C-alpha cells in the first residue's frame, strides 16, 4: 500500500510549499490523480485477497471504502474552500494538512492486517477530527462537541485494546490472515461475555448504537462541512470494519447474546426516524437519519448472514455518499441564509431550480428508490432480517413508512411553498457548488449499473 | 363604514403607482434582442436505426447466449403439418354429433 501512502505523504509538502493563491487548485488536482490511481486496488480474486505485504492487505470489503475515502477528500476540499477565504494562509494550510493527515490515517486504518495496528491508527484518526471540530466550527457548542465526541469513543475502546492485547497473549498473533485459520470457538461464560462486551462496545459507540448516539447530533450542527462530510460518510464506517474484522473471533457466543443490541437498534431506529419527523434543523435531521441507517447496519452485521453482509456493505457506501451530499445541500442553504432553521427559507424552487433538482435527487436516493444501491443494500438487509425472524418485518415496515415521510417533508418545506418575502440574498448557482453536487451524485447513480464491486467480501 | 380622507388618499396614490408600474411593464417592439446563429427524417432516424441496432444485438449477442430468448412452442392441432419434419399429426376421431 506504499503506492498510495507515499503520494499522500508527498502531497503533504505540496500543500506546504504551494503559493498563496494556488493551494486549492494544486491540492484538488493531485488528490484527483490519487483518486484515479486508487482504482488499481480492484485486482480481486474469488478466493484470495490482494495481500500486498506483511502488514498491508485489502480484500473485496475494504477496497470500496478506500476508493470512497480518497474520492471524498477532493469533495471536502471543494466544500470547505469558501468560508476559509478570509482565514489566514498558514491556518488554511493547517486545515488542508489536517484533512490530508485524516485521509492518510483512514487509508492506513482499512488496510491494517494486524488488529493492533488497526486500533492504533483507528484512533489516531481521533486527533484531526477533534481539532477540526473544535477549531473551525461556528458556534459555542463546538467546545461541548469536542467532549461528547471524544469521551464517548475512547471510553468504548480503552477496554477493547486490553481485550486485543489479551488475544495477543492467547492466540499468539492478532494478524487477520492467521486468525482465519487459528480461530477457536468461544464458550459460554461470564469472562467470554465481558470479552464480547469489550470487543463490541467501541464500535457500538462508533456506529453509534441507540442510547450511545448523543455524540452524533451535537457534533454535526456546528462543524465545518469538511468535518461534517468526513464524520457522516467515512468516519462512521470504522464501526462496520470493526464488525467485519472482529466478529470472526466472537463465535458462537454472538448468536445468543446480541438480542438486546438488536432490540435497542431496531426500536432506536424507529425512535430516531420519529425524531426526524419532528426536527427544526437540517443538520440534526440528517444526523438522526444517519443514526437510523447505522442502527440498520448494526442489525445487519449482528445477524451475520451472507445476504446481510452484502446489504450492510452496500447500505454503508450508499448512505455515506447520500449523507455527504445531503450535508452539502444543508451547507449551501446555510451559506445563503446564514441560519439552520428549516422553516425560515422556504419555496426555493421558485428561485433556485438546479438546487431543487439536486434536492429531489437527494430525497429520492435517501428513501431507497430502486434500482439505486441504497435500495439494494436496504432490501438485502430487509430479507436477512426477515430470515432471522418473521415479526422483524413489522418493526421494519413502519420505519420504511417513516423514512419516506420525513425524507420528502425535509425537501418540501425547504423547496415548495410561498417563498419568504424578507429574504433577498439568494444568489444563483455557483459553478463550484453544482460541480461538487454532481460529483457527489453521478457515482451514486453509476454504481447501480455495476453493483458487484461494492457487494462485500463474499459476493 | 366609509373611507377616511387619509386612507382614501393613500389608496388613491397607491393605485396610481400600481397603474404606473403596470403601464411600464410593457416591452418595446425591439426586445427581445436574440443573438444570431426532412419530411421523412423521423421515420428513418427514430425507427429504422433502432431496428437495425436491436436486431444486430439480439441476433449476434443474445441468441448466442443460451436460455435468453425462451419462446413458448406453438400449439399443435389435428390436421396440421410440421414444416421441419413433414410428419402429419393423424386425424382426430369423428365427433359423436348431437346438433
Amino acid at each position: 500500500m506504499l503506492k498510495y501512502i507515499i503520494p499522500t505523504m508527498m502531497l503533504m509538502p505540496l500543500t506546504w510549499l504551494s503559493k498563496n493563491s494556488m493551494i486549492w487548485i494544486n491540492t484538488t488536482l493531485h488528490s484527483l490523480l490519487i483518486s484515479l490511481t486508487s482504482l488499481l486496488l480492484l485486482n480481486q480474486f474469488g478466493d484470495n485477497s490482494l495481500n500486498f505485504s506483511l502488514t498491508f492487505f485489502s480484500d473485496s470489503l475494504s477496497t470500496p471504502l478506500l476508493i470512497l475515502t480518497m474520492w471524498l477528500l477532493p469533495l471536502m476540499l471543494m466544500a470547505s474552500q469558501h468560508h476559509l477565504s478570509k482565514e489566514n494562509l498558514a491556518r488554511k494550510k493547517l486545515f488542508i494538512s489536517m484533512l490530508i493527515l485524516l485521509q492518510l490515517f483512514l487509508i492506513m486504518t482499512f488496510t491494517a492486517t494486524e488488529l493492533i495496528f488497526f486500533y492504533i491508527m483507528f484512533e489516531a484518526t481521533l486527533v484531526p477530527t477533534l481539532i477540526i471540530i473544535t477549531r473551525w466550527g461556528n458556534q459555542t457548542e463546538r467546545l461541548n462537541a469536542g467532549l461528547y465526541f471524544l469521551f464517548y469513543t475512547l471510553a468504548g475502546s480503552l477496554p477493547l485494546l486490553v481485550a486485543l492485547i489479551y488475544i495477543q497473549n492467547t492466540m499468539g498473533s492478532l494478524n487477520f490472515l492467521i486468525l482465519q485459520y487459528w480461530v477457536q470457538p468461544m464458550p459460554n461464560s461470564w469472562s467470554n461475555t465481558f470479552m464480547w462486551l469489550a470487543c463490541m462496545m467501541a464500535f457500538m459507540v462508533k456506529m453509534p448504537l441507540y442510547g450511545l448516539h448523543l455524540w452524533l447530533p451535537k457534533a454535526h450542527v456546528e462543524a465545518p462541512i469538511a468535518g461534517s462530510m468526513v464524520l457522516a460518510a467515512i468516519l462512521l464506517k470504522l464501526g462496520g470494519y470493526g464488525m467485519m474484522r472482529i466478529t470472526l473471533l466472537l463465535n458462537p457466543i454472538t448468536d445468543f447474546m446480541a438480542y438486546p443490541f438488536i432490540m435497542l437498534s431496531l426500536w432506536g431506529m424507529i425512535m430516531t426516524s420519529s425524531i426526524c419527523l419532528r426536527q427544526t434543523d437540517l443538520k440534526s435531521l440528517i444526523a438522526y437519519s444517519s443514526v437510523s441507517h447505522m442502527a440498520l447496519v448494526i442489525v445487519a452485521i449482528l445477524i451475520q448472514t451472507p445476504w446481510s453482509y452484502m446489504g450492510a456493505t452496500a447500505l454503508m457506501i450508499a448512505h455515506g455518499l447520500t449523507s455527504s451530499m445531503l450535508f452539502c445541500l444543508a451547507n449551501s442553504n446555510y451559506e445563503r441564509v446564514h441560519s439552520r432553521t428549516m422553516i425560515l427559507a422556504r419555496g426555493l424552487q421558485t428561485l433556485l431550480p438546479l438546487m431543487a433538482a439536486w434536492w429531489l435527487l437527494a430525497s429520492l436516493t435517501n428513501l431507497a428508490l430502486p434500482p439505486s444501491i441504497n435500495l439494494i443494500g436496504e432490501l438485502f438487509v430487509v430479507m436477512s432480517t426477515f430470515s432471522w425472524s418473521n415479526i422483524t418485518i413489522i418493526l421494519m415496515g413502519l420505519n420504511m413508512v417513516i423514512t419516506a415521510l420525513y425524507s420528502l417533508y425535509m425537501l418540501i418545506t425547504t423547496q415548495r411553498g410561498k417563498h419568504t418575502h424578507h429574504i433577498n440574498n439568494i444568489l444563483p448557482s455557483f459553478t463550484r457548488e453544482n460541480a461538487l453536487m454532481s460529483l457527489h451524485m453521478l457515482p451514486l447513480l453509476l454504481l447501480s449499473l455495476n453493483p458487484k464491486i461494492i457487494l462485500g467480501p463474499l459476493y | 363604514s366609509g373611507y377616511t380622507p387619509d386612507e382614501k388618499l393613500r389608496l388613491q396614490q397607491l393605485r396610481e403607482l400600481r397603474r404606473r408600474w403596470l403601464k411600464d411593464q410593457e416591452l418595446s417592439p425591439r426586445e427581445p434582442v436574440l443573438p444570431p446563429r426532412r419530411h421523412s427524417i423521423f421515420a428513418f432516424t427514430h425507427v429504422l436505426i433502432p431496428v437495425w441496432i436491436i436486431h444486430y444485438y439480439l441476433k449476434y449477442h443474445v441468441t448466442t447466449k443460451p436460455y435468453t430468448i425462451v419462446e413458448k412452442k406453438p400449439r399443435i392441432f389435428p390436421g396440421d403439418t410440421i414444416l421441419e419434419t413433414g410428419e402429419v399429426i393423424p386425424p382426430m376421431k369423428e365427433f359423436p354429433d348431437q346438433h
Binding site: 421558485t350 410561498k418 417563498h419 | 387619509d6 403607482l17 408600474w21 434582442v33
Partner: protein, 177 residues
C-alpha cells in the same frame, strides 16, 4: 376580533357577517336560481322583521340563537370561490410570483437583451432610494410615542413626495404571470 386596523367587531358588523355567511350557505344549499332567490328574499324579510330592534341585549340574544341555528343548519361543503381560500385554485398560480430583486441577479449579457426595461428599473430604484429617507422622515415625526397605536399607514401629505412605505405593497406581481 382580529383585524389589521380595529380591535373590536361592532355588533352591526357581526350581524352583516352573519347575513353574508348564512345567505352564502343558503345559496350553496339550494342550487337553482329561483329557489335561491325565493329563500334569499325570505331571509332578507326575516332580517327586516328583526331589523327594528334597538335593544342591544335583545339583539345580542337573537344573534346567539341565529348563530346556533346557522351552525345547526349549514351545509357540510359550502361553495367556495376558485380564488378564495379553501377553493380548488387557491394559491395555485403562486409558483410564478418571482419577486423583482431576482432581476438584480441577472447576468450582464442578458441585461442588454431588454435595455429599456432595465433602464426603467434602475431609474425606479433610484426614485425609491431617494424617497426612502423622506418617507422615514415622514414616519419618524407622525408616529405617536411608544410606537403606533394602529397599523393603518399614513398617506403622503405633500405633493411630489411618494407615499410612505410604498414599495413592497405596490411591488407584488400580477395574479396571472
Amino acid at each position: 376580533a382580529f383585524l389589521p386596523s380595529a380591535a373590536y367587531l361592532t355588533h352591526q358588523q357581526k350581524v352583516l357577517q352573519l347575513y353574508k355567511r348564512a345567505l352564502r350557505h343558503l345559496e350553496s344549499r339550494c342550487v337553482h336560481r329561483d329557489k335561491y332567490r325565493y329563500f334569499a328574499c325570505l331571509l332578507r324579510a326575516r332580517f327586516d322583521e328583526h331589523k327594528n330592534e334597538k335593544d342591544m341585549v335583545k339583539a345580542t340574544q337573537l344573534l346567539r340563537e341565529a348563530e346556533k341555528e346557522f351552525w345547526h343548519g349549514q351545509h357540510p361543503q359550502p361553495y367556495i370561490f376558485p380564488e378564495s381560500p379553501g377553493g380548488t385554485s387557491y394559491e395555485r398560480y403562486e409558483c410564478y410570483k418571482v419577486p423583482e430583486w431576482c432581476l438584480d441577479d441577472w447576468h450582464p449579457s442578458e441585461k442588454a437583451m431588454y435595455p429599456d426595461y432595465f433602464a426603467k428599473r434602475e431609474q425606479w430604484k433610484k426614485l425609491r432610494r431617494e424617497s426612502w429617507e423622506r418617507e422615514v422622515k415622514q414616519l419618524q415625526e407622525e408616529t405617536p410615542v411608544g410606537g403606533p397605536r394602529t397599523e393603518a399607514l399614513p398617506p403622503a401629505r405633500k405633493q411630489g413626495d411618494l407615499p410612505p412605505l410604498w414599495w413592497h405593497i405596490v411591488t407584488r406581481p400580477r395574479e396571472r404571470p
